[PDB]
Amino acid sequence: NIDGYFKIYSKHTPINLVRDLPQGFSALEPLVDLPIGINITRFQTLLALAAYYVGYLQPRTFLLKYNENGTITDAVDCALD
Amino acid sequence: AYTNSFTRGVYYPDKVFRSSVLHSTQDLFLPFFSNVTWFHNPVLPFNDGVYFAST
Amino acid sequence: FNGLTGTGVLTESNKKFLPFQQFGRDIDDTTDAVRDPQTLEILDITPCSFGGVSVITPGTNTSNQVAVLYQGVNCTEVPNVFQTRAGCLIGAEHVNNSYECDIPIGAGICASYQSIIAYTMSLGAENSVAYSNNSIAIPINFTISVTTEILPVSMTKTSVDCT
Amino acid sequence: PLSETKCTLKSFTVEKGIYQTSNFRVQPTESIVRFPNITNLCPFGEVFNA
Amino acid sequence: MYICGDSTECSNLLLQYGSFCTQLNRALTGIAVEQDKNTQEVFAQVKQIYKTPPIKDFGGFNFSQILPDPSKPSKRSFIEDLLFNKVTAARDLICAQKFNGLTVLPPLLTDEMIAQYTSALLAGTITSGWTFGAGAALQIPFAMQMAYRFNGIGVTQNVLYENQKLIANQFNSAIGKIQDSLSSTASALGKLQDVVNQNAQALNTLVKQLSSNFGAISSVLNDILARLDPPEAEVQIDRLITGRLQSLQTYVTQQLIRAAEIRASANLAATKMSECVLGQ
Amino acid sequence: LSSTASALGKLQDVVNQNAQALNTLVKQLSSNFGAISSVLNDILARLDPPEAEVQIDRLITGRLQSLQTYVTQQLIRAAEIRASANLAATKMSECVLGQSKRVDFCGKGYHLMSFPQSAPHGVVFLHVTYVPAQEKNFTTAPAICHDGKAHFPREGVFVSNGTHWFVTQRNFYEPQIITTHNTFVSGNCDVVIGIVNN
Ligand SMILES: *[C@@H]1O[C@H](CO)[C@@H](O[C@@H]2O[C@H](CO)[C@@H](O)[C@H](O)[C@H]2NC(C)=O)[C@H](O)[C@H]1NC(C)=O
Ligand SMILES: *[C@@H]1O[C@H](CO)[C@@H](O[C@@H]2O[C@H](CO)[C@@H](O)[C@H](O)[C@H]2NC(C)=O)[C@H](O)[C@H]1NC(C)=O
Ligand SMILES: *[C@@H]1O[C@H](CO)[C@@H](O[C@@H]2O[C@H](CO)[C@@H](O)[C@H](O)[C@H]2NC(C)=O)[C@H](O)[C@H]1NC(C)=O
Ligand SMILES: *[C@@H]1O[C@H](CO)[C@@H](O[C@@H]2O[C@H](CO)[C@@H](O)[C@H](O)[C@H]2NC(C)=O)[C@H](O)[C@H]1NC(C)=O
Ligand SMILES: *[C@@H]1O[C@H](CO)[C@@H](O[C@@H]2O[C@H](CO)[C@@H](O)[C@H](O)[C@H]2NC(C)=O)[C@H](O)[C@H]1NC(C)=O
Ligand SMILES: *[C@@H]1O[C@H](CO)[C@@H](O[C@@H]2O[C@H](CO)[C@@H](O)[C@H](O)[C@H]2NC(C)=O)[C@H](O)[C@H]1NC(C)=O
Numbered sequence: 001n002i003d004g005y006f007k008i009y010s011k012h013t014p015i016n017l018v019r020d021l022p023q024g025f026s027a028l029e030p031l032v033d034l035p036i037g038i039n040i041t042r043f044q045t046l047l048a049l050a051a052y053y054v055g056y057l058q059p060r061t062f063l064l065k066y067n068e069n070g071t072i073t074d075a076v077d078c079a080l081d
Numbered sequence: 082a083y084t085n086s087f088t089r090g091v092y093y094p095d096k097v098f099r100s101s102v103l104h105s106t107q108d109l110f111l112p113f114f115s116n117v118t119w120f121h122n123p124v125l126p127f128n129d130g131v132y133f134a135s136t
Numbered sequence: 137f138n139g140l141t142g143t144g145v146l147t148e149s150n151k152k153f154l155p156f157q158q159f160g161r162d163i164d165d166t167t168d169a170v171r172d173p174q175t176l177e178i179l180d181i182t183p184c185s186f187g188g189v190s191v192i193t194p195g196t197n198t199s200n201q202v203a204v205l206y207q208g209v210n211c212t213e214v215p216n217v218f219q220t221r222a223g224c225l226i227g228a229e230h231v232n233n234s235y236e237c238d239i240p241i242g243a244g245i246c247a248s249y250q251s252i253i254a255y256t257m258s259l260g261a262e263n264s265v266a267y268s269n270n271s272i273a274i275p276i277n278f279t280i281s282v283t284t285e286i287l288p289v290s291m292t293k294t295s296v297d298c299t
Numbered sequence: 300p301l302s303e304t305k306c307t308l309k310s311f312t313v314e315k316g317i318y319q320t321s322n323f324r325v326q327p328t329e330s331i332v333r334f335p336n337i338t339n340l341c342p343f344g345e346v347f348n349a
Numbered sequence: 350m351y352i353c354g355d356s357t358e359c360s361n362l363l364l365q366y367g368s369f370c371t372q373l374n375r376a377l378t379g380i381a382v383e384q385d386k387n388t389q390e391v392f393a394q395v396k397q398i399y400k401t402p403p404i405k406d407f408g409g410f411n412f413s414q415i416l417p418d419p420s421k422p423s424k425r426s427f428i429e430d431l432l433f434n435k436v437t438a439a440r441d442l443i444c445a446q447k448f449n450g451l452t453v454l455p456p457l458l459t460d461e462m463i464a465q466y467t468s469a470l471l472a473g474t475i476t477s478g479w480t481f482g483a484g485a486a487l488q489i490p491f492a493m494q495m496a497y498r499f500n501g502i503g504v505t506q507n508v509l510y511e512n513q514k515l516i517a518n519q520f521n522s523a524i525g526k527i528q529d530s531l532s533s534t535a536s537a538l539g540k541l542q543d544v545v546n547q548n549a550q551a552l553n554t555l556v557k558q559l560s561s562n563f564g565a566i567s568s569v570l571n572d573i574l575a576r577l578d579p580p581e582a583e584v585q586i587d588r589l590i591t592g593r594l595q596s597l598q599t600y601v602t603q604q605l606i607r608a609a610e611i612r613a614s615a616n617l618a619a620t621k622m623s624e625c626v627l628g629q
Numbered sequence: 630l631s632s633t634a635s636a637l638g639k640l641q642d643v644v645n646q647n648a649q650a651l652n653t654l655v656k657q658l659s660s661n662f663g664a665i666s667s668v669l670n671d672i673l674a675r676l677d678p679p680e681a682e683v684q685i686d687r688l689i690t691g692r693l694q695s696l697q698t699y700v701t702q703q704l705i706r707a708a709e710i711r712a713s714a715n716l717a718a719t720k721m722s723e724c725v726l727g728q729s730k731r732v733d734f735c736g737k738g739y740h741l742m743s744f745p746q747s748a749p750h751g752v753v754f755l756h757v758t759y760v761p762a763q764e765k766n767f768t769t770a771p772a773i774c775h776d777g778k779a780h781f782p783r784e785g786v787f788v789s790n791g792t793h794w795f796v797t798q799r800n801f802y803e804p805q806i807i808t809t810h811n812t813f814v815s816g817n818c819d820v821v822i823g824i825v826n827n
C-alpha cells in the first residue's frame with residue numbers, strides 16, 4: 001500500500017523441491033492497482049473445509065539485470081557486504 | 082522458526098521495458114538472506130507491505 | 137501516446153514486449169519503442185532529421201558562386217545533388233579523377249576550384265623502387281637548400297580589473 | 300548562401316575555406332494523439348430521463 | 350537544441366542571455382580541426398607511395414608477417430587485424446546522431462589511407478634504409494643495411510656476415526613470439542581503450558544531466574509550459590536555462606583540458622616516427 | 630617572401646584568437662540578463678535602493694560568469710603558447726649553437742646550420758640543408774676474398790662499373806683503388822654469402 005494505492009503482485013510456478021524455497025530467481029508482474037485509500041496495519045487469512053511464510057518489505061537499493069527480452073534474470077543487493 | 086530466504090522477493094519496479102542493461106532501483110524490497118517466519122487464525126501486523134508465500 | 141509527447145518518425149516494429157509491459161527505453165533513458173493503445177502493436181521511433189549547413193567558397197575575389205553542404209542527413213528530404221558519407225553537397229559536380237586537393241570536406245572527399253569540383257583526395261605520385269640483391273644507387277651531385285619555419289613565442293599582455 | 304556567409308562573418312570579403320552558417324530541422328508536418336477506448340460512461344439518464 | 354528543443358518562449362528567454370551559444374561552437378570547431386591536424390602531422394611524412402616488389406630475397410628475414418596481404422578485407426597486414434579485433438561496419442548508413450543535438454563527425458582520413466601510408470613507410474624502410482627521408486630513395490641490399498646499422502653502434506660489420514643465419518632465425522622467432530604476446534594477453538592495449546571509455550562516459554553524463562529538477566517543478570519543458578500560465582511560468586524556466594548552461598560549459602572545459610594532453614602525445618608520436626623510423 | 634603573402638599563418642591565427650576573445654568579452658557587457666536595462670546608471674536613477682538591488686544582483690552574477698569564462702580560456706591558451714616557446718628555445722639551443730644529428734628536426738636533409746630572425750611575436754629560422762641528386766646505380770658485393778683471406782672495407786662500400794672494383798663513400802661517388810690500407814681481413818671466404826674473387 002503506497003499513499004492510498006493498493007498494488008498486488010503474484011507468481012505461480014511449479015517447483016521440483018518439496019523441502020523449502022528452492023534456489024533460483026522468479027520475478028513478479030503487477031496485476032491490480034486500486035486506489036481505495038485505506039491505511040492498514042493488521043491483516044488475516046480465512047478458510048473453509050496450513051503453512052504460509054510471511055516477510056516484511058524494507059527500503060533498499062538493488063541492481064537488477066535484464067536479459068534480451070526484458071525479464072529479470074538476477075539482482076544484486078547493494079548494502080549487504 | 083526463521084528460514085533464510087535466499088534470493089526471493091524481487092519484482093518489476095516500473096512499467097517500462099529494458100533490454101541488456103543494468104538498472105539501479107530504490108524501492109521497498111525484501112533484503113537478501115533475511116529471515117522469514119514459518120507459520121501454521123494467527124493474525125499478523127502489516128507495517129508497509131507484506132511478502133506472502135505459500136505452498 | 138498515452139500522454140507522453142515528443143517528435144519523431146514512426147516505423148513498424150517487431151520487438152518482444154511482455155503482455156503487461158507498455159513501452160521501451162534505451163540505455164541513455166530515451167524512449168525507443170512504444171505500444172499503441174488501440175491494437176497493441178509494437179512501434180519504433182526514430183529522431184527527426186536535423187543538421188548543420190556549411191558553405192564552400194573559392195573566395196569572393198576569385199568568383200561569386202558557392203556550394204552548400206548539408207552535414208549528416210540522408211538528403212532525400214532537402215529543400216547537382218552529390219551524396220557523400222558526410223551529408224551531401226549541392227552545387228558541385230563529381231569527377232572520377234584524384235588530385236592532391238584544396239580545402240577538405242570529410243570522409244576522404246574534398247573539393248576545389250577549376251568550377252567547384254568534388255572528388256577523392258590522392259596521397260601522391262605512385263612509384264615502385266626496383267629492388268634487387270646485387271645493385272646499389274649512389275648519388276653524384278649535391279644541392280644546398282634553404283628552409284624557413286615560424287615559431288610563436290609570446291602574445292600581448294592584457295589586464296582586466298573587476299570593480 | 301554567400302550573403303548569409305558575409306553576414307555571419309561580419310565582413311564584405313571571404314577567403315577560401317569552409318564556413319558554417321546555421322542548422323536546419325525537418326519541421327513536423329502534423330500531430331498524432333492516441334487514447335484508449337472511452338468505456339464505462341456515467342449514467343446520466345437516471346437523473347435526467349426520469 | 351540541447352537547452353530546450355522546439356520551443357519558442359524558451360528561445361525568446363535564451364536570446365536575452367547575450368551570446369552564450371557561439372563561443373561553444375567556436376571552441377568545439379577548433380578542437381575538431383586540431384584533431385585532423387594531429388592525424389595529418391604523424392603519418393603524412395612520405396612524398397610518394399612506394400610498394401614492395403614481388404621479389405622476396407631479404408637474406409633470410411621473413412617480413413610476410415607485417416607486409417600487407419592483397420587478399421585481405423582492407424589490405425591490412427595480419428597484425429593490424431589482431432589490433433583491430435582486440436579493441437571494441439561503420440559504413441552501413443548515416444544515422445550517428447542522438448535525440449538532443451549530439452552529432453559525431455567522421456574523420457577526414459579513413460582507415461584505407463592510413464593503411465596505405467603505413468605500407469609506404471614500411472616498404473621504403475625495407476628497400477631503401479634511411480635514404481628515403483632526406484632525398485630520393487636509393488635501393489640497397491637488406492643484408493648491407495643491417496651491416497651498416499650494426500656498424501652504427503660500434504660493432505664491426507663482419508659480425509653479420511659470419512652470423513647471418515643465427516640472427517635471421519632470432520628475428521623470425523621474435524616475430525613469432527610477439528604474435529602470441531599480442532593474441533593471448535589483452536591488457537597490453539591499455540592506452541587506446543582509456544580515451545574511448547573517458548569520452549563515452551563524459552557523453553553519457555552529459556546526456557543524463559537532462560533529467561534534473563534543478564529546483565524547478567519538473568525537468569520537462571513542455572509540461573511546465575502547458576500547465577502554468579505564461580506570466581508566472583517564466584521564473585521556473587530560468588532555472589533549467591541556468592543549469593543547462595553550467596552543464597554544457599563544464600563539458601566544454603573538460604574537453605579542452607583533455608584534448609591538450611592528446612595533442613602533446615600526438616606530437617611525441619610524431620617525433621618518434623620521424624626519428625626512430627626514418628633513421629637510427 | 631617578398632611576393633607570396635599568407636605564409637605567416639600561425640602568428641596571424643594567434644593574434645586573431647586573442648582579438649576575438651577580447652571582442653566577445655567587451656560585447657558581452659550589453660545584455661539585460663533578465664534585468665530592466667544593461668546599464669547600471671539607468672536602474673540607479675529610476676528605482677529606489679530597497680528594490681533596485683535585485684537587478685544589480687542579476688547583472689553582477691552574469692558579468693562575473695562571463696569574466697570567469699574568459700580567464701579560463703586565456704589560461705589554456707597561455708599554456709599552449711608556453712609549450713611552443715619551450716620547443717622554440719630547444720631548437721634555438723640545439724641547431725643554432727651546433728649541428729643536429731637527429732633526423733628531420735631542422736630541415737629536410739642533412740643539416741648544416743641555421744640563422745635566427747625576429748618577427749612581430751615569434752621567431753623565424755633559416756635552415757641550410759644538404760640534399761643529393763643525380764643518382765647512378767652499380768653492382769655491389771659484401772666482401773672480396775684474395776689469396777684465401779676475405780677483406781672487408783673500412784669505411785665505404787664496394788662498387789663496380791662493369792669490369793673493375795672500387796671502394797666509395799656512401800653519400801658521394803668517389804672511386805678509389807682497393808688496397809690493403811683501406812680494407813681489413815677477417816677469416817676465410819667459405820661462410821660468407823656474396824664473396825667475389827679479385
Ligand atoms: C527471447 O524470446 C525469443 C522468442 O522470440 C526466444 O527465442 C526462442 O528460444 C526458444 C528456446 O530455444 C526456441 O525454442 C524458439 O524457437 C525461439 N524463438 C525463435 C527462434 O523465434 C529467446 O530464447 C528468448 N530469450 C531469453 C528468454 O533469454
Ligand atoms: C477499442 O475498440 C476497438 C473496436 O472499436 C477495438 O479494435 C479491435 O482490436 C482488435 C485487436 O486489438 C481487432 O482484432 C479488432 O478487429 C478491432 N475491432 C475493429 C472493429 O476493428 C480495440 O481493441 C478496443 N480497445 C482499444 C484499447 O482500442
Ligand atoms: C637502376 O637500375 C634499374 C635496373 O637496371 C633501372 O630501373 C629500370 O630502368 C629501365 C631503363 O630502361 C626502366 O625502363 C625501368 O622502368 C626501370 N625499373 C623500374 C622498376 O622503374 C633504374 O633506371 C636504374 N637507376 C637509374 C638512376 O638509372
Ligand atoms: C652538378 O650540378 C651543378 C649545378 O646543377 C653543375 O654546375 C653547372 O654546370 C653547367 C655546365 O657547366 C653550368 O652551365 C651551370 O652554370 C653550373 N651551375 C652552377 C650553379 O654553377 C655541375 O656541372 C653538376 N656536376 C655534374 C658532374 O653533373
Ligand atoms: C435522454 O433521452 C433523450 C431523448 O431521446 C436522448 O437524446 C437523444 O438520444 C439519442 C439516442 O442516444 C441520440 O441519438 C440523440 O442525439 C439525442 N439527442 C439529444 C438532443 O440529446 C438522451 O441521450 C437521453 N439521455 C440523456 C442523459 O439525456
Ligand atoms: C614466414 O612466416 C609465415 C608465417 O606467417 C610462414 O607461413 C606459414 O608457414 C608454415 C610452415 O609450413 C605453415 O604451416 C603456415 O600455414 C604458414 N602460414 C601462412 C599464413 O602462410 C612462411 O612460410 C614464412 N616464410 C619464410 C620465407 O620464412
Ligand SMILES: *[C@@H]1O[C@H](CO)[C@@H](O[C@@H]2O[C@H](CO)[C@@H](O)[C@H](O)[C@H]2NC(C)=O)[C@H](O)[C@H]1NC(C)=O
Pocket residue numbers: 210211212219220221441442443
Ligand atoms: C540514403 O537513403 C536511401 C534510402 O532511404 C538509401 O538507399 C537504400 O534504399 C533502399 C530502399 O529504401 C533501402 O532498403 C536501403 O537500406 C538503402 N541503403 C542503405 C545503405 O540503407 C541510401 O543508401 C542512403 N544513403 C546512404 C549513404 O546510406
Ligand SMILES: *[C@@H]1O[C@H](CO)[C@@H](O[C@@H]2O[C@H](CO)[C@@H](O)[C@H](O)[C@H]2NC(C)=O)[C@H](O)[C@H]1NC(C)=O
Pocket residue numbers: 790791792793
Ligand atoms: C670502368 O672504369 C675503368 C677505370 O676507369 C675503365 O678502365 C679504364 O678505361 C680507360 C679508358 O676508358 C683506360 O685508359 C684505362 O687503361 C682503363 N683501366 C684503368 C685501370 O683505368 C673501364 O673502361 C670502365 N668500364 C666501363 C664499361 O665504363
Ligand SMILES: *[C@@H]1O[C@H](CO)[C@@H](O[C@@H]2O[C@H](CO)[C@@H](O)[C@H](O)[C@H]2NC(C)=O)[C@H](O)[C@H]1NC(C)=O
Pocket residue numbers: 269270406822823
Ligand atoms: C642474389 O639473388 C640471386 C637470385 O636469388 C642469387 O642467385 C642464386 O644463387 C643461389 C646460390 O648458389 C643459386 O642456388 C641460385 O640458382 C641463384 N639464382 C639464380 C636465378 O641464378 C644470388 O646468389 C644472390 N646474391 C647475393 C649476393 O645474395
Ligand SMILES: *[C@@H]1O[C@H](CO)[C@@H](O[C@@H]2O[C@H](CO)[C@@H](O)[C@H](O)[C@H]2NC(C)=O)[C@H](O)[C@H]1NC(C)=O
Pocket residue numbers: 825826
Ligand atoms: C674463386 O677462386 C677460388 C680459388 O681460386 C675458386 O675455388 C676453387 O677454384 C678451383 C680452380 O678454378 C676449382 O677447381 C675449385 O672447384 C674451386 N672450388 C673449391 C672449393 O676448391 C672459385 O671457384 C673461384 N670463384 C668463385 C666464384 O669463388
Ligand SMILES: *[C@@H]1O[C@H](CO)[C@@H](O)[C@H](O)[C@H]1NC(C)=O
Pocket residue numbers: 003004037038039
Ligand atoms: C496513514 O496513517 C497516517 C498516520 O500514521 C494517517 O494520517 C493517514 O490518513 C493514513 N492514510 C490513509 C490513506 O488513511
Ligand SMILES: *[C@@H]1O[C@H](CO)[C@@H](O)[C@H](O)[C@H]1NC(C)=O
Pocket residue numbers: 083114115116
Ligand atoms: C535470523 O535468525 C538467526 C537466528 O535467530 C540470526 O542468527 C540471524 O542474524 C537472523 N537474520 C536476520 C536477517 O534477521
Ligand SMILES: *[C@@H]1O[C@H](CO)[C@@H](O)[C@H](O)[C@H]1NC(C)=O
Pocket residue numbers: 197198
Ligand atoms: C585576386 O586573386 C588574384 C589571383 O589569386 C590576385 O592576383 C589578385 O591580387 C587578387 N585580388 C585581391 C583584391 O585580393
Ligand SMILES: *[C@@H]1O[C@H](CO)[C@@H](O)[C@H](O)[C@H]1NC(C)=O
Pocket residue numbers: 230231232
Ligand atoms: C566513373 O566511372 C564509372 C565507371 O567507370 C561511371 O559509372 C561513372 O559515371 C564515372 N563517374 C563520372 C562522374 O563520370
